[PDB]
Amino acid sequence: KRSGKPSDLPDYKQVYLPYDTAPTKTELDRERRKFMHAYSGRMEHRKMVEVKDVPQNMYTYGKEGMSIPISIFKDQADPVIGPEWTYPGIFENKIVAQHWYMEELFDREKSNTFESPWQRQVLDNQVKRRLGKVAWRMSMLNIKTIDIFHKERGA
Amino acid sequence: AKRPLAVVAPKTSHKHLFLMHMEKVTVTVSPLLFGYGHTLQKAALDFYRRGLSARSPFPSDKMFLYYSIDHITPKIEVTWLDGSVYVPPLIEGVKAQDLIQMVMEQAWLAADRMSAEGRVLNPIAIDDYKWEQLIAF
Amino acid sequence: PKTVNIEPGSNRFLDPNVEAKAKDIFAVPEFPNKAVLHNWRFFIKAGKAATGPPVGQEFSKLGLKAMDFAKAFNDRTKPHFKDDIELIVRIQVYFDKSYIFRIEPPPTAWFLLRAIRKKRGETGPVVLRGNYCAYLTLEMCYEIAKMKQMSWGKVEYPPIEVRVRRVVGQARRMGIAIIGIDTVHSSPVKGMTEKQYLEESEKHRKVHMIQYEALKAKELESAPLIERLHRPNMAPLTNTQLEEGLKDANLLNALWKSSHPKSLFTQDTRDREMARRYLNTRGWFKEMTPEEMRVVFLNYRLPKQEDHQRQLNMTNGQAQSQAYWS
Amino acid sequence: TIADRVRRYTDIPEASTEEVNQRWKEHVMPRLQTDLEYNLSHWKKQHRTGAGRPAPPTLNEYSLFSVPDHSSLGQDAIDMLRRREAQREEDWWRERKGQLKPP
Amino acid sequence: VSRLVSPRLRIIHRDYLTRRGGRTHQRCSAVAVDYTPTYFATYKSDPGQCPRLIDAEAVHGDEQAFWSARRDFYRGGASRSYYPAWDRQAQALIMLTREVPRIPQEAAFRLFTLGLKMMLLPRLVAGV
Numbered sequence: 088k089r090s091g092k093p094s095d096l097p098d099y100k101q102v103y104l105p106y107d108t109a110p111t112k113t114e115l116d117r118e119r120r121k122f123m124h125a126y127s128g129r130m131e132h133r134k135m136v137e138v139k140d141v142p143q144n145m146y147t148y149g150k151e152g153m154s155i156p157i158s159i160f161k162d163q164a165d166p167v168i169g170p171e172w173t174y175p176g177i178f179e180n181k182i183v184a185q186h187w188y189m190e191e192l193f194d195r196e197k198s199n200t201f202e203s204p205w206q207r208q209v210l211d212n213q214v215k216r217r218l219g220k221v222a223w224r225m226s227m228l229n230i231k232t233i234d235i236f237h238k239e240r241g242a
Numbered sequence: 243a244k245r246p247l248a249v250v251a252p253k254t255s256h257k258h259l260f261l262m263h264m265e266k267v268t269v270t271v272s273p274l275l276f277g278y279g280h281t282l283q284k285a286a287l288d289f290y291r292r293g294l295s296a297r298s299p300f301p302s303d304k305m306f307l308y309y310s311i312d313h314i315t316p317k318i319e320v321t322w323l324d325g326s327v328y329v330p331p332l333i334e335g336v337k338a339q340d341l342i343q344m345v346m347e348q349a350w351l352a353a354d355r356m357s358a359e360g361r362v363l364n365p366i367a368i369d370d371y372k373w374e375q376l377i378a379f
Numbered sequence: 380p381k382t383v384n385i386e387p388g389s390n391r392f393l394d395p396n397v398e399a400k401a402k403d404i405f406a407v408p409e410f411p412n413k414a415v416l417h418n419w420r421f422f423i424k425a426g427k428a429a430t431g432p433p434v435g436q437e438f439s440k441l442g443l444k445a446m447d448f449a450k451a452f453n454d455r456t457k458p459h460f461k462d463d464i465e466l467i468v469r470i471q472v473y474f475d476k477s478y479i480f481r482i483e484p485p486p487t488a489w490f491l492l493r494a495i496r497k498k499r500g501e502t503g504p505v506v507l508r509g510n511y512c513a514y515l516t517l518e519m520c521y522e523i524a525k526m527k528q529m530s531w532g533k534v535e536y537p538p539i540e541v542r543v544r545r546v547v548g549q550a551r552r553m554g555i556a557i558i559g560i561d562t563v564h565s566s567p568v569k570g571m572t573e574k575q576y577l578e579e580s581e582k583h584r585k586v587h588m589i590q591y592e593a594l595k596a597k598e599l600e601s602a603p604l605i606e607r608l609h610r611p612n613m614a615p616l617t618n619t620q621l622e623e624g625l626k627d628a629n630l631l632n633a634l635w636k637s638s639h640p641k642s643l644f645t646q647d648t649r650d651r652e653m654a655r656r657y658l659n660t661r662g663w664f665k666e667m668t669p670e671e672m673r674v675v676f677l678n679y680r681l682p683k684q685e686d687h688q689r690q691l692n693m694t695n696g697q698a699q700s701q702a703y704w705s
Numbered sequence: 706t707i708a709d710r711v712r713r714y715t716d717i718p719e720a721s722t723e724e725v726n727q728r729w730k731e732h733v734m735p736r737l738q739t740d741l742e743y744n745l746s747h748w749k750k751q752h753r754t755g756a757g758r759p760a761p762p763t764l765n766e767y768s769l770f771s772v773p774d775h776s777s778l779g780q781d782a783i784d785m786l787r788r789r790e791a792q793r794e795e796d797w798w799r800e801r802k803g804q805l806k807p808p
Numbered sequence: 809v810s811r812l813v814s815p816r817l818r819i820i821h822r823d824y825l826t827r828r829g830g831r832t833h834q835r836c837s838a839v840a841v842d843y844t845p846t847y848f849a850t851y852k853s854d855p856g857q858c859p860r861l862i863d864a865e866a867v868h869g870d871e872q873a874f875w876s877a878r879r880d881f882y883r884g885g886a887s888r889s890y891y892p893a894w895d896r897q898a899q900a901l902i903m904l905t906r907e908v909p910r911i912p913q914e915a916a917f918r919l920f921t922l923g924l925k926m927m928l929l930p931r932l933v934a935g936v
Contacts, residue, residue: 089499090422091486095463096496103380106569118567125511125556126563138511138556145558149516150566151382155494158461159484159526163397166522167383171583174521175388176540176591177559178584181517184544185560186551190795207679209544214788270861273901276725277894278772279718284893287875291890294412294876299474302412307864307871308856309904311741312814315840327852331822331838412872599881604767605895606881610777613785621786628717628775631782635773642768644728701765705736705907737905742859744908745866749856752866759868762902770898
């Protein structure tokens with residue numbers, strides 16, 4: 088949809104650097120050279136793919152002291168980013184937040200070997216959805232008969 | 243009464259406890275009485291929720307809860323414009339849609355008796371009995 | 380150079396300045412217990428609300444001169460706002476035609492395209508588009524998540540970390556590959572070795588837990604009393620007990636009493652042993668003395684601090700001390 | 706058989722609400738102020754000040770009415786029974802896909 | 809012997825012939841103990857001037873928010889069911905049976921009744 092999209096896109100205004108030792112040019116494109124790829128899909132169906140619009144320097148990118156242009160209010164500029172351990176659960180989310188195939192999660196539960204104590208919570212919220220996709224799948228059939236893939240598909 | 247009362251009464255199911263002609267619907271219970279599971283304590287208190295529901299067009303400020311003490315079985319008392327109070331008998335096994343049906347069904351009889359004594363009656367907004375409606379498709 | 384605040388995760392809220400006027404406009408004019416007729420939703424700019432088809436029409440379907448609301452809107456939204464901040468209005472029309480509307484921060488999809496500088500059509504899920512779009516890092520989502528609080532009366536009803544996994548997933552669903560995950564290496568730093576980077580996370584990532592738990596436990600001590608009630612876990616019951624325990628409820632009763640954590644009312648040997656004599660006839664749990672049940676038949680939804688608290692009640696002077704006073 | 710198949714519906718709520726009557730008449734009844742008619746009249750006064758004292762109950766005061774609750778018990782037994790049926794898909798499609806592997 | 813010796817409580821019985829089973833005409837009984845019509849005058853006043861009955865607004869404000877309250881510690885959505893009536897009384901029964909503050913002001917006369925025997929015994933003794 089067109090509405091609900093930003094028209095003016097402010098640019099990353101670096102507030103203060105996160106380091107005293109300049110990351111010399113030589114290594115910049117030596118580590119960014121590693122980021123132009125990012126995995127996708129988490130199982131045997133692991134798919135290392137490409138990322139368009141790669142930023143140029145990631146020592147400075149987001150780790151600290153850069154601004155993000157979600158400028159909303161009148162007196163609130165592009166907020167600065169505090170260091171990592173200043174945000175709650177970040178290196179804990181790194182374990183939890185990701186595309187989780189249930190194939191990859193139920194072997195972790197039936198072996199009770201969770202990398203994280205919240206993957207027990209990203210599991211329920213994932214099954215509690217798929218049950219809802221059924222309790223809605225059926226509270227509709229109490230109206231009519233809805234038949235999957237019975238209408239034409241494609242062009 | 244200025245004339246013999248009605249004979250035939252409309253017979254339809256009432257979803258919501260709209261103020262047909264009542265003036266105050268009080269619901270007395272005694273929380274000293276207790277019970278797990280479907281009892282009369284539960285059947286009358288959901289009738290409070292089902293009346294206070296954001297769905298029923300009942301004026302929420304006209305329903306009065308009343309915690310009693312002396313082991314008063316849950317009473318539901320409705321008062322009509324003429325002031326004649328009416329307690330729907332809480333037969334065991336009853337629940338919300340019965341009481342919302344009892345008081346609303348009796349609401350047409352009682353509003354009829356008020357219209358017999360000579361009380362002028364008002365226009366009612368809701369028409370629980372579909373009369374100006376036809377099923378369309 | 381200058382780290383603004385060195386604390387293990389104390390930046391979970393907006394500045395009290397911006398958080399002051401955060402809820403001055405994002406407030407819910409309380410539900411009048413009326414019967415809603417229409418729950419409309421719009422995108423509207425900072426204060427550029429018109430009487431046109433976007434707003435004035437749906438009122439005019441109902442005969443309301445929405446030339447007024449737009450002003451009552453701009454009576455609250457014209458100041459306070461950076462230019463061109465498309466807000467969401469939740470107009471709610473009651474059976475008396477009297478509306479009540481909550482203004483809300485922009486949709487996080489609007490936030491996400493800003494924080495990455497991409498216009499409409501540039502972003503997409505990889506399975507439709509084939510490429511991860513603009514990068515991000517978890518450090519950024521934590522600030523999109525600060526202006527997105529479901530209960531703008533209770534700014535952190537969902538704790539912030541829980542809120543981020545939401546905005547992260549919405550991002551990934553748009554192609555926004557953030558760096559901390561999705562990639563072989565996290566954000567490279569000129570500070571220290573990857574090990575001297577990982578050894579500084581293994582402490583931080585766990586210091587947060589005693590921070591995150593305490594905030595999860597302080598929440599449960601003010602939660603509905605029914606919430607802190609006992610709900611035994613069902614992971615132990617195997618799916619034939621779990622089914623043979625649904626035909627007759629007696630088993631799911633005697634279970635509850637059998638594994639209720641100790642309280643001033645459940646220190647009845649015969650009451651606890653009456654259940655324990657019911658299960659044995661049913662061939663249910665027989666080799667698990669009461670203790671190893673409570674540690675497995677506990678409400679798993681308790682914050683570790685609180686499960687540990689209920690588990691050791693007999694040690695806590697017994698609950699024989701805490702009773703309904705009078 | 707009549708009084709049986711209805712006992713599916715009431716004895717358990719009775720086996721409960723006959724244990725509370727025991728708990729009530731044993732622990733709270735002794736320390737219960739019997740002058741309620743004066744006590745209630747005190748809150749009808751505290752309400753005519755508006756700044757009265759409606760106090761919220763606490764867990765220890767409330768755990769008297771802690772009971773086997775089939776609102777939750779019967780529910781999460783199904784869900785846990787179900788997230789085993791949801792568990793036997795990824796473990797099924799892993800088994801079927803495991804039949805294409807040679808011996 | 810009055811059944812419920814509380815004389816204001818009056819037991820009323822009402823047996824009805826209601827349509828059960830769709831066609832039948834069964835016997836349903838609505839038994840109840842309710843207050844004697846004596847105790848109906850001071851109650852059809854809205855302040856509940858009749859004691860033994862407390863306007864629920866007293867024990868807490870806005871039952872419009874206390875009974876209409878829906879479970880939501882984290883049960884938001886379709887599972888935000890109303891609260892079960894069995895505790896929704898308890899959180900109101902426990903509020904009824906709280907400590908009301910017996911003040912020492914009443915205790916003085918009761919204390920003036922505590923030293924009743926010990927000092928009235930020598931009164932008639934020393935008054936001959």
